[PDB]
């Protein structure tokens with residue numbers, strides 16, 4: 001009786017659970033635009049303000065929980081992408097559930113404190129919440145698990161420099177700029193490796209997932225580092241069509257981003 | 272009775288049908304130089320002028336038909352290079368025939384409105400007409416089809432920015448320059464990939480076409496993108512002699528073009 | 543070769559064993575559908591092209607014992623209403639594709655002795671067929687399966703619907719609606735909870 | 750195949766030589782631990798999976814002559830107190 005099997009792929013349900021949140025609520029906001037609130041808006045604004053103690057400790061807490069979620073994803077990346085499991089039996093899923101409900105509460109608190117709802121809805125933090133939080137609820141409901149877009153929490157590394165700034169660790173602007181550049185580069189490296197790993201190990205959808213390549217996450221990190229330095233050994237490469245398309249897009253985007261960030265590098269070098 | 276076979280290669284007939292147009296008429300123009308016209312010249316000049324409505328709608332139409340021809344070539348690139356077919360049975364060939372006779376009429380109208388015939392004969396639009404339009408007539412006469420140099424219509428994508436300018440979509444010069452650079456890069460990328468795909472899947476002529484490599488068009492696009500970024504994985508590469516020669520020439524030309532276009536990139540970056 | 547037995551349109555019995563067959567071309571039985579017994583045992587067959595048995599219509603008992611087959615494609619077998627017995631003993635078959643047995647009505651006799659069956663969700667249609675069609679007790683004792691990670695002591699016929707309960711059936715409209723509505727409903731609940739907390743705190747402060 | 754000799758739980762002698770064996774699956778002797786003599790000589794065996802002889806407990810004399818074995822893993826043989834000759 002105890003057995004584990006892949007069965008039928010259910011990735012589309014997990015993806016739709018985020019798409020029909022994001023796009024549908026965007027349409028709802030647009031239609032509302034076509035067609036004690038101030039007090040509670042001010043209360044939520046001062047709740048998440050970086051000046052007060054509550055905002056500081058809360059952003060430190062959400063950064064720590066993002067680090068924990070990234071570590072959980074790193075641990076779980078050594079497993080089959082789609083697998084059945086019991087929510088009550090395993091407590092790591094419970095830890096991820098607690099982290100994600102805290103993220104949801106933080107997102108709601110941010111959404112109350114928003115002068116412009118539409119421009120808040122297009123922020124990177126909002127979209128990472130959309131593509132992270134509904135999948136864990138769908139997974140715990142369906143009693144299954146999909147790897148999915150859980151690496152996108154690495155995009156919350158960008159605030160890392162800010163986390164130092166109000167703990168009296170960074171004072172000068174040059175060090176803050178250097179830490180910001182390093183954090184941005186590390187975060188985009190990690191998330192690009194995450195997409196490459198997902199699209200390579202998942203396989204092509206229209207070919208019944210027969211193009212899957214056994215690539216670990218760290219091998220994809222190595223591939224991204226080799227590619228972005230224009231070395232290209234060719235020992236490891238993307239074999240799927242969608243993986244190759246993502247590699248081409250990543251090459252173009254990385255070259256454009258580096259060309260845009262050259263002047264900041266020169267300013268950091270200085271005279 | 273119904274069967275399809277390659278038989279003998281007839282690419283040389285299609286190529287000669289363009290060479291004995293281009294070079295022979297160039298010699299005719301040169302010999303004529305060695306050895307109501309004004310009214311009709313002015314009429315043709317005002318017919319194709321960008322100021323009047325007729326010129327605007329006509330250049331929009333020819334750009335749209337060039338896009339359609341590029342899509343037709345993209346669809347047909349998933350077939351054997353040389354193949355027999357019935358013109359009456361298939362109507363996609365009829366669509367391509369209509370597109371190409373419209374291109375021929377536009378070329379004639381342009382040639383009437385030419386102060387210098389010889390310098391008009393050396394334009395990129397004239398040469399793409401020469402290497403595109405006679406092959407479809409030869410194909411419909413011989414009841415066969417060869418892939419040929421039908422990707423060269425992508426070279427009309429350079430006009431794309433102009434297509435925006437008189438539709439009140441681009442006003443500032445910086446955006447126009449950026450769109451022009453992007454269109455030029457995309458067009459040269461696509462046509463280089465087209466030559467690479469043709470010369471790779473066709474095989475070496477002097478070795479009885481036994482060096483053919485099963486490379487799709489998009490794989491060649493990926494190869495060109497990998498090469499132009501100086502990555503060079505080596506998973507896919509040109510194996511034929513002529514393909515390697517074309518790759519060397521493309522590398523040299525791309526490096527020279529990028530070195531020439533660096534100052535425009537710097538101006539777009541600005542201060 | 544294709545059309546190897548051409549001219550024998552009224553053939554009824556065909557036996558090929560101990561011959562060491564290793565490659566059978568597709569559509570090699572053109573006009574041989576009349577046969578009822580087909581023995582292809584004691585060979586080295588590995589893969590079968592789809593549509594190979596498609597011209598066969600009157601075939602009743604089929605034997606594929608002592609071969610090197612690993613995966614048996616449902617398209618290769620097709621739909622044979624007149625088939626009654628089938629044998630796959632002494633092979634290298636690990637699992638059977640679901641719905642393969644449902645294509646043909648009569649599968650009264652089946653022999654799967656010696657195959658390295660890896661019991662799992664995949665085998666559940668076969669176990670259900672065992673529930674519908676019980677094997678002989680001796681054959682049930684002989685036919686076993688491999689349990690990954692531990693001993694293979696589990697018999698193939700010992701499994702019940704409790705093992706099938708792990709398998710996830712295709713989701714109905716109810717589950718689809720729930721998995722579509724989990725996201726937006728949870729976000730609205732979070733927004734409402736935060737708004738209610740803020741309104742209550744404002745009311746307490748203003749008092 | 751796994752469980753090839755199923756049903757012979759009281760088997761004591763088993764001889765397989767001159768057969769040209771080339772691949773023996775792990776746990777193929779499920780319930781065959783009762784045997785005392787096992788002859789697997791004159792074959793083409795190259796590697797033995799660990800735990801293959803683990804179900805065997807009463808085995809006394811084991812023969813692996815005339816094979817293609819290169820490395821003999823200790824985990825494959827395990828601990829057989831009743832073995833006397835090899």
Ligand SMILES: CC(C)CCC[C@@H](C)[C@H]1CC[C@H]2[C@@H]3CC=C4C[C@@H](O)CC[C@]4(C)[C@H]3CC[C@]12C
Nearest residue numbers: 009011127131149198199202203204205209242
């Ligand atoms: C920027 C983000 C938030 C939105 C963009 C959507 C991206 C992430 C989506 C759109 C299409 C998706 C892919 C579609 C199909 C499959 C096959 C299946 O095995 C799951 C993974 C995989 C490979 C998906 C990965 C995620 C994917 C690439």
Ligand SMILES: CC(C)CCC[C@@H](C)[C@H]1CC[C@H]2[C@@H]3CC=C4C[C@@H](O)CC[C@]4(C)[C@H]3CC[C@]12C
Nearest residue numbers: 280282398402420469470473474475476480513
């Ligand atoms: C710049 C353009 C307009 C003119 C230059 C001529 C080029 C495009 C011509 C000249 C020689 C030609 C090649 C000569 C021989 C063959 C073999 C045959 O299988 C057809 C394709 C192929 C490989 C031709 C491709 C096109 C080709 C490379």
Ligand SMILES: *[C@@H]1O[C@H](CO)[C@@H](O)[C@H](O)[C@H]1NC(C)=O
Nearest residue numbers: 579580602603604626627651
């Ligand atoms: C099926 O036919 C074969 C061919 O002779 C026969 O040996 C076998 O016993 C038959 N099977 C059954 C179940 O009658």
Ligand SMILES: *[C@@H]1O[C@H](CO)[C@@H](O)[C@H](O)[C@H]1NC(C)=O
Nearest residue numbers: 785786787809810811833834
């Ligand atoms: C071990 O048993 C075998 C089995 O017959 C026998 O031939 C052999 O002589 C025995 N060895 C010893 C040392 O008694």
Ligand SMILES: [K+]
Nearest residue numbers: 230231501502
């Ligand atoms: K390089």
Ligand SMILES: [K+]
Nearest residue numbers: 231232502503
């Ligand atoms: K390289």
Ligand SMILES: [K+]
Nearest residue numbers: 230231501502
């Ligand atoms: K390189």
